[PDB]
Amino acid sequence: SKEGSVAPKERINIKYIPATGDAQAEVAEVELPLKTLVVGDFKGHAEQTPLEERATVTVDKNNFEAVMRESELKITATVKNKLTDDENAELPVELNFKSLADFAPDAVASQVPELKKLIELREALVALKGPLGNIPAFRERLQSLLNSEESREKLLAE
């Protein structure tokens, strides 16, 4: 960290060392944004901490998916069971919401294990419809399964 210089003399000795600079820190009167405080019940319980210790979170369009994920909106309730022939049956659920698409029935039914087997039932039926009507030899062996009733029921349990 030393500039190469010459021996000093009656001749003039130019050297290059860059200087510290003068900033003179510029004024900037920033203005006040119209800040609102949305207050109200945003989760499914009553928090045990008193009000003077809990915090306010700032939400804009870019971080709304992160504020919703870190809230852990866990909605646990007992709802009516309409998956069988019982009218007086009930079925509690367990919900974990991390995005705005978790309100949609694609992700609500995916978090209910009684509905994970019904979408998997439908996905197995959409898979059937493609190769069903293309090969006309499927109905030829439906009558063979109509004939072979013993070996068919042994394979349905598997």
């Binding site: 500039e3 190469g4 210089s5 010459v6 021996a7 001749r11 130019i14 050297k15 290059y16």
Partner: protein, 135 residues
């Protein structure tokens, strides 16, 4: 195509490419110094200080450090630099010479500087930033 002929043809016909392009009528001159690259580091080992070297006499004092003499704009290095100690000791003694006479020393690195030993495999290098952070 001999190593004594071609290295002494490129170092001399390449000067003619520097003489033919530059317009000497438009206030330009060029000095020609015969050193060898192994002699020059010995000449910086010769003097105890870079301000008493033999190359300092031709860059600074015979040119710039002279009443009425024309000063030196830049030093063309007709060299092939390695990253070894006899070529980082030279450039340490050419950066200090270039900071005294105010003239940058321009030269070139070789194929072996990048560690390829044959030059046409340079675009095959997929990360050149990590090559320079080697011990």
């Amino acid at each position: 195509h001999n190593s004594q002929f071609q290295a002494m043809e490129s170092a001399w016909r390449g000067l003619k490419l520097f003489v033919d392009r530059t317009d000497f009528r438009e206030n330009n001159k060029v000095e020609i110094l015969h050193v060898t690259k192994d002699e020059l580091l010995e000449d910086f080992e010769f003097a105890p200080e870079t301000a008493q070297s033999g190359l300092y006499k031709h860059v600074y004092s015979a040119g710039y450090g002279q009443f009425g003499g024309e000063p030196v704009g830049a030093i063309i290095g007709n060299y092939a630099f390695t990253p070894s100690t006899p070529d980082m000791k030279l450039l340490q003694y050419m950066g200090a010479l270039g900071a005294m006479a105010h003239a940058p020393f321009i030269s070139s690195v070789g194929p072996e500087f990048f560690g390829i030993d044959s030059f046409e495999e340079l675009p095959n290098i997929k990360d050149l930033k990590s090559t320079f952070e080697s011990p």
